[PDB]
Design a protein around this ligand. Sequence first.
Ligand SMILES: COC1=C(OC)C(=O)C(CC=C(C)C)=C(C)C1=O
Ligand code: SF4
Ligand code: SF4
Lengths: 97, 115, 125, 171, 208, 112, 176, 48, 376
Amino acid sequence: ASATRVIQLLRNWASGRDLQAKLQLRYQEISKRTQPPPKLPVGPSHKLSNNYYCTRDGRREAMPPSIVMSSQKTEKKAVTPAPPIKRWELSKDQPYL
Amino acid sequence: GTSVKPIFSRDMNEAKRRVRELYRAWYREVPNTVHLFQLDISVKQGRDKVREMFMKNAHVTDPRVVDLLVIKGKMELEETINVWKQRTHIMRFFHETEAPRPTDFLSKFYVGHDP
Amino acid sequence: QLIAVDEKLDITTLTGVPEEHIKTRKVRIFVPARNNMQSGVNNTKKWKMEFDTRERWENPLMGWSSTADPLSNLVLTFSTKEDAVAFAEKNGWSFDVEERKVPKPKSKSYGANFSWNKRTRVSTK
Amino acid sequence: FGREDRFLNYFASMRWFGGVPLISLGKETVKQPVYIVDVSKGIINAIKDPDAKGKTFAFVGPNRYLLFDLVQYIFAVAYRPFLPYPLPHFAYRWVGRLFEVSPFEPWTTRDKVERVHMSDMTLPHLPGLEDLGIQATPLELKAIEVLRRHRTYRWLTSEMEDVKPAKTVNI
Amino acid sequence: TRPTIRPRNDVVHKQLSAFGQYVAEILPKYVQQVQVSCFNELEIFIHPDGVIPVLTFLRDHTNAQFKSLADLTAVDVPTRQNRFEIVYNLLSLRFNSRIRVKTYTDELTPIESSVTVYKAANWYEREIWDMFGVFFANHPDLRRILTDYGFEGHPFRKDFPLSGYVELRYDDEVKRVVAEPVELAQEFRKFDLNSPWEAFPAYRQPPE
Amino acid sequence: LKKTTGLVGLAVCETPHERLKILYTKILDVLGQIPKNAAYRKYTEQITNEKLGMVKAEPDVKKLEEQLQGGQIEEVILQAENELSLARKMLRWKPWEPLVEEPPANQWKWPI
Amino acid sequence: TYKFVNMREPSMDMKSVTDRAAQTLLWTELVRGLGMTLSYLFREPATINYPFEKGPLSPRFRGEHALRRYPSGEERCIACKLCEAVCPAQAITIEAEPRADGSRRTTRYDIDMTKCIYCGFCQEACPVDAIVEGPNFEFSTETHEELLYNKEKLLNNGDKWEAEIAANIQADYLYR
Amino acid sequence: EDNKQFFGRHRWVIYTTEMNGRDTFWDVDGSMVPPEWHRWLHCMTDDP
Amino acid sequence: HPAAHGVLRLVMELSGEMVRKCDPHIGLLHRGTEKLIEYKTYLQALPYFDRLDYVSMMCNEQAYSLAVEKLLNIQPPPRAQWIRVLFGEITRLLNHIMAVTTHALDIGAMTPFFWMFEEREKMFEFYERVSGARMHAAYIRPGGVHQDLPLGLLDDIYEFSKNFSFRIDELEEMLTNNRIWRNRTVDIGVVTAEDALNYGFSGVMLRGSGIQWDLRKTQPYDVYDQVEFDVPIGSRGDCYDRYLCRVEEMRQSLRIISQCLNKMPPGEIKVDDAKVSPPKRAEMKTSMESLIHHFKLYTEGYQVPPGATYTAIEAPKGEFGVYLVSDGSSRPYRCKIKAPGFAHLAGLDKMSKGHMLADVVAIIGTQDIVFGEVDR
Ligand SMILES: COC1=C(OC)C(=O)C(CC=C(C)C)=C(C)C1=O
Ligand code: SF4
Ligand code: SF4
């Protein structure tokens, strides 16, 4: 910033923080608007051999849903959809604001 | 038997009673609608339009269909009474900007291909 | 309890469709024919319902194609012909039904290509 | 006559002064006003009519009114007090001349005063609206849509069938 | 099979199947089918008369506790005698699980309102009625929610046209907005995209 | 002893053991009127007997909370009240009867 | 893992009680807010001097559409209609026929710009880089009809903006 | 250009007073910038 | 109305300035999105999710992409998922700035809006640099992301993130301890935990009443299990606690953004399956299979196996879900969108009991409602 030092002191005293250290306007620390060209990696299925598509076909491995207890067609412990959720812990970083 | 369940009415007589109650409510409401919406029509025109809307589906013989029609009529009456509706909505019942469509064979032949 | 109606199903007064697009429409209930450019048959398994073709004209600006009937794009899909007939009847539309066309089985013989006395022998491969 | 007309609106404007000056109290003038939508529809139909090539039409309303009764009805529909007083032709003409000097749209002119106090001609030998398929709209069904703007807040919600149509000198 | 294919969790699948068996055992009067999908989602198919008991049991039972109604909607399948499918999506915070409850109805048969069971259902039911025309009995205030005042029809039905039947414009003669039959400068262009060759053999249907 | 359970509208309960015992006894009383072979009765009786037995065996409310795995004993009491209400409703509904009105032939068939 | 936002308890000693009393009676926090506004008053504003200064853009920016040519002047578009097929708004209308020399070329290429959502799908779908979204964004009109582009308008836009479009493409095609 | 200014104010254009046919002493707009200077001015490149 | 937050006809029943009844009328922005989706391919329907909740675009893209990926039984590459979480946290920051500053503007504090919308502008620049569009990028796709990051984007994201905390601090200095702000927000629109659970609330509307729920912690989706953050919890269930929760969520999302910046892995950006994801342009112009797959994916689109899913994410406004039904073709049969604002607004009449006009204005702001997703 181009502010004179007395203005900087006035700003820092009015706000209570050193404003100059973290300016909202970005002066010149940003990336250049022109960059070198990228190379870019190909990916996992680019292998020349041992790459048959039937071994990596996600869509063809989907199947219709499993039918449990179709109506047309002891011990018996009670059950729940999933184990009970476990209590959250209280923020070793900063528990209270 | 056909094993069907009702909405409100068991036969056509209860359905007709509900239709008569809805007609009474709309007939009572028309003058207030003309006053509140500042319509340029008369109360007679509004009541004739209400009667025409009722007669448009006077051929229904299913009590469930009549029940749903009465429910829809009550919904429309609630919209009118609370002023949710605007003047344009009330006046859409009259089709004031639509040119008449002729119904005889010769005029339809003259204008276009539609039957 | 139940009320035991004995009428015919008719929902036309509840669908909000204008009177013109109920009485003057004719829907077609058919299984689409196979596209003759391809050998696949996966598009000839279901029944289709479509409305009669209405007028299209050229837009004075841009020369685009204009339409005035709202049902020009509506196409329904049904598992059987009876379901489509029931839907059309309960909606009040008059319909035409075309029976499904199936390719009849054929007798193929690779050895017939080289027959000793028949006309089936092939001059080239 | 219509929402933007210089007919019904013109009469309504006179209330600010106090009284309504009329030549001969409007008892010797007969008017046959026609609705705007009827005229527009008649023009559209004359475009589409192959028989109306060289024809000459007269577009008039269904009723004929005395000027006094027409202005009384106009003031009744707007719920304004009607104070008609007779003004001689020369006095009215003098008043018209004064208004004319306006560099903007004049409130009235000598020509406007002349045309206002002139009876509408009867030309039964000419074809009319009914020969183009138009049923002319009476003033009693469309006056409220023009004059509701001229009412005070107290009378703004009054309905159309409340103001007792005027007497027409027909036949 | 490793990099590009979504992983499958067997443990979750087993738990959902057991809970589906549990729910089907407890309510045999209404449950017609229980299903668990391969991406770990559990579905329960019920008779329309069991809407209230099943939802209440799933909300209030100690082993269920699905206290939140995530979503309620309808699906229209015109080929079925019962046109409309009603889908409830429930989430359980106590057991960190989700469940889906399904039922069916047609144009003239009402479904019981689930407002007593869930406060959230009041708006969803209104939207189902507006978009599909399904009536819910004993609703506190049933009326249109999304469509314009006086709008006719139910636009989510398959039969309803995409562009509707009417349009709006301002008319200077009547000095208001008027409704007229739809006319389009350019008609929407329908595409036929489906391939004539079958894609997924695992879903092939018997040839009837 | 504890303040502010942490959920808005959920007051702290004093003497929660007595409340839980009362609620579990009432639940068992209601379940006693359901047919013995009904699955709801036996499953609910099993779980509520486990919870009652664990309540009777622990005087410390924190260790009771960590044993019940039910999240903050006040919500355990709320769940017990919910279960009692459900038990009465279930007694009225009788959902242990056989299935009514099997669905149509292809009601649930997808695709189409 | 969770934290509390409003679960603190104030001190009850005489010192802090008098501190809070002085806060109540002398408006200290309000003075602090005034001080923050005063601090902002003396900073440099973030406003730019449009139209003499412009906002920063990137080579990937999607603007007004254009049709491109090969270096010889021949058009790139070959009427494959992939852009028409993929367009989510149905904003592209295309007609074609064999040209007088047998080439596969269009006779109609219209883009309704009041239908377009400017998603850039058409330029991804194009296999010859014929249709692009160019960097221009200042093309407001006074009538609706000026935003219904035909083939001549799009070709003129391409000829007008090619010098920038080619440089923008050179800067991004290695990411595509 | 003035690189001491913050990003957005470090480049600017002073428009001409006469373009193809109109007097632009007062009436200027961003569409008077040709494409090459358009690319430089909007910071899509670093090279003028 | 300035405080109507777009198109809302809130019919209100008042005795003096006291509110007796709130009757929210909606549908003034109902555009019929779901039918339109029924008329498109899965790629063509993606830009609609940008315009559902136009303050959190990439989050909607992520939810829809997760649902389509689940129905496709495929998996995005790790770099795509890290990019998705990074931009989801950036989107959360954008949404929370919008929500807090416009709530303050309704209540009468205009300055923080102007202070924070400059940060919003810089984040729009990040959006445009990655996709070419400031707010409807359409970057996140079912197979991953459309394009890789430009060579200097992470540096500028780091430069923004190392300074955003001071802006949060300035906003907090303006609002948190102001007695007028506390008078206008404390004890306004209190809702109990049980009523919030029953009414279908989600997100901050649950957390402000003490409910310890967050989908990123309980049901993580992309790489949210590999980042660390805290969940702010309120204790009074009023507007002030929800405001504090949103500020702390901005701080936690800054934390997550730092972690995502440090742990960005290399590799491809979309699944290496050309029958779902389009190939690169050079491959399309060089090899036959790539051209065929490009043609078919941009004309017909990929077929999704039949089935139905409900996929939900932790959107900045609450739980955002899609009930997507597939019939086996390239077009969805049905796509029901679940917006949290729908339930939140349906619960407005309950939250307004015993309050005044200004209290109701404040209550609308606290709910964080966008009507694009409410009306759909
Ligand atoms: C983000 O939420 C929104 C608002 O609240 C901030 C609005 O005011 C409005 C409209 C009103 C002003 C003038 C922009 C819209 C459209 C909106 O979406
Ligand atoms: S940018 Fe998108 S909406 Fe616009 S023409 Fe191209 S494909 Fe169509
Ligand atoms: S612009 Fe490109 S995609 Fe569109 S028709 Fe021409 S070549 Fe095909």
